[PDB]
Amino acid sequence: ESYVETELIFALAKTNRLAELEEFINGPNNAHIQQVGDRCYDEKMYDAAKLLYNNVSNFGRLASTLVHLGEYQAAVDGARKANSTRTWKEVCFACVDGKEFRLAQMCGLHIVVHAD
Amino acid sequence: GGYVAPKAVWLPAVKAKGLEISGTFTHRQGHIYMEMNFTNKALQHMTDFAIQFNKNSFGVIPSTPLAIHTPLMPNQSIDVSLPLNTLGPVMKMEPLNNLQVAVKNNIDVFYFSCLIPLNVLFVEDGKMERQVFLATWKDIPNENELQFQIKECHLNADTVSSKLQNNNVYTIAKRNVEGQDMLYQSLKLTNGIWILAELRIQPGNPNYTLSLKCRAPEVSQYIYQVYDSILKN
Amino acid sequence: ELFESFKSFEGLFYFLGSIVNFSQDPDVHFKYIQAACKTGQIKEVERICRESNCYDPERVKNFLKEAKLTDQLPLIIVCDRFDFVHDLVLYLYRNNLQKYIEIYVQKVNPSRLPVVIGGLLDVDCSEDVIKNLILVVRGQFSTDELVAEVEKRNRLKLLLPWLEARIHEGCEEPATHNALAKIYIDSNNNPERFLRENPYYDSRVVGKYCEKRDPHLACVAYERGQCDLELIN
């Protein structure tokens, strides 16, 4: 199925059993990420949609989840390749709020192409 | 030209091993047609098309073989005009205007029914002389008179008359009676049966009273139906 | 079901392959496909799978992504027939892509070039192969939406050799010419001489671009286009 598997990993987030969830995931998932994967950060149950969107390479979305998660270094480490105007405004505003300022300007470099 | 109903699905592909027929009837300058669209929704070519009708109230039959000469390939859809006439065997059906049809191809024979709108059976020579109208109305037993309601009509007598005329229903006389328009009309079927009508249009009444007199009153309900359709379309 | 009860090698397979003609239960047809894959002869069936398209390509495509053949190419056809291109090319990047995209755009359809390329840029591919496929002969193409998705990704720096080789013979396409104008905007200089000897580009376009940028150049833009009122405004 997908239903079984999707809601399964969903409940696994409900029971925070990631250290075996994401590992089982490597099999023939037959499921659909980014729908329960959404619900993860939607329900604030972070750190898994992290791994999901990781194994699906969902840059920005994963970086946004890093932000909400409190992960901010690897956030910019993913932004360096994501490089979406989204990614940039995210890292800007968050890192300013994150009160990191050096790396803040280091990432703000990449937006000034847009004077908006 | 008279009223022609939109084509309806008569035989769905899934009931006929992929053959889908849609159809309607028309009347073109004294000639009746069964106008159809045949579509091949199967995966085999279809050939050897043929059609027949069961015996029916007005003796309706195809007048020629069905004019499909090439294989109808998968996914193809053709329009077919089948000329009909009323020279065929008569058996009274219920409902009176029902027609049973069999269509064959190289795969199988399939059956369906459809309802003939009676206006295609309204002949060109159906305009009674005033004198004859009065006499015939009087001759027909009063118990044969039947009343029907054309609901929610707002056409003027003039427009009613012109539309009906286009369907070979003739207005013989009009009477203005204290604001009311009374239209006296005749029509004649392919089998020779006359139907006389009095249409009463009243001010403030959105419904017209159609009164029909016929020596075969069972037909009346069906004239009403198509009379209604012609006025509403 | 009584077939599949046993090994059910291919007998009722051929049976359906006959019955498929006006057989509109796509599930049994998909099982039939699975059978054709048991000993792979979909080659002669994938063709009718192009014809037969009354199914649900979802569990079909799932079966496919489980049905391992390594050279199947109807999956691309049903894909762009239903626009499953995103996830398709997604898993394609996941495993491999050398010519599948290429053989598709060359034989099947060079239409969806730009959208699939934008997908590649989304999945952050290796630009080189994009260059190479650009070198590969194509049919038709629309540059506008291509450079639009580019301006999303902001990484046009790579079709410019294609434009170089293309204008190298002198295609007077205002599209490609204003594209050149854009890459020169990027080049940060003054091609007014170019702006004049090129009547091919769209001055209105370059002007509505440089609205922010370079009025001192929108001057000659509107002067080629005689856009005096725009020059005012």
The candidate with the shortest Cα–Cα distance to B112, out of B23, B41, B44, is: B23
Quick one: DSSP state of residue B7?
P
With beta carbons under 8 A apart, name residues in chain B contacting C22.
13, 16-19, 40-44, 107
- Residue A84 to chain C, least CA–CA distance (Å): 8
B201 SS3 class: strand
- Which sign, positive or negative, has the C-alpha torsion C83, C152, C183, C197? positive
B98 CA to chain C: closest CA distance, Å? 28
In whole angstroms, give the CA distance from residue C25 to residue C32: 11
φ, ψ for residue A74 (rounded to 5)? -60, -20
The CA distance from A30 to the nearest CA of chain C, in Å, is 8
Which residues on adjacent β-strands are paired with residue B11?
B21
Tokens linked to B18: 């992929």
B53: amino acid identity, one letter:
F
Contact between B226 and B3 under an 8 Å Cβ cutoff? The reply is: yes
Q: Which positions in chain A touch C124 (Cβ < 8 Å)?
A: 57, 59, 81
Of C20, C22, C52, nearest to B107 by CB-CB distance is C22
Kindly list the residues from chain A whose CB atom is less than 8 angstroms away from the CB atom of residue C62.
30
Q: Where are the alpha helices (DSSP H) in chain B?
A: 130-139, 157-165, 220-231
Chain B nearest-CA residue for C52: B43
User: DSSP of C95-136, one letter per residue?
Assistant: H--SSHHHHIIIII-STTHHHHHHHHHHTT--HHHHHHHHHS
**Which residues of A lie closer than 8 Å to C, measured between beta carbons?**
28, 30, 57, 59, 81, 113, 115
Resolution (A): 9.2
Q: Is C181 left (phi over 0), alpha (psi -120 to 50) or beta?
A: alpha
Report CA-CA distances (Å) from C57 to B197, C48, C80, C229: 59, 14, 11, 55
φ, ψ dihedrals at C124, nearest 5°: 60, 65
d(CA A65, CA C151): 26
Contact C35, C10 (CB under 8 A): yes
Give start and end residues of each alpha helix (H) in A1-116: 3-14, 18-25, 36-42, 49-55, 61-69, 73-82, 85-97, 102-108
CA separation for the pair B129, B133 (Å, rounded): 6
Task: Give the C-alpha separation, C210 to C204, whole Å.
Answer: 10
Structure tokens at C43: 């080659």
CB-CB neighbors (< 8 A) of B17 in chain C: 21-22
- From chain A, the residues in CB contact with C188 under 8 A are none
Task: Give the CA radius of gyration of chain A.
Answer: 16
CA-to-CA separations, B69 to A39, B50, C129, in angstroms, rounded:
61, 11, 54
Cα separation, C133 vs C120, whole angstroms: 12
- Which candidate from C66, C123, C212 shows the least CB-CB separation from A57? C123
Radius of gyration of chain B (CA): 20
Tokens of B204: 């403030």
List chains touching C (3+ CB pairs under 8 A): A, B
DSSP-derived 3-state class of residue B140? coil
How many other CB atoms are found less than 10 A from the CB of residue B6? 7
Look at residues C114, C167, C185, C101 and name the one whose alpha carbon lies nearest to residue C143.
C114
Instruction: Phi first, then psi: give them for residue B162, nearest 5 degrees.
Output: -75, -40
- Contact B18/C23, CB-based, under 8 Å? yes
Cα separation of C117 and C113, whole Å? 6
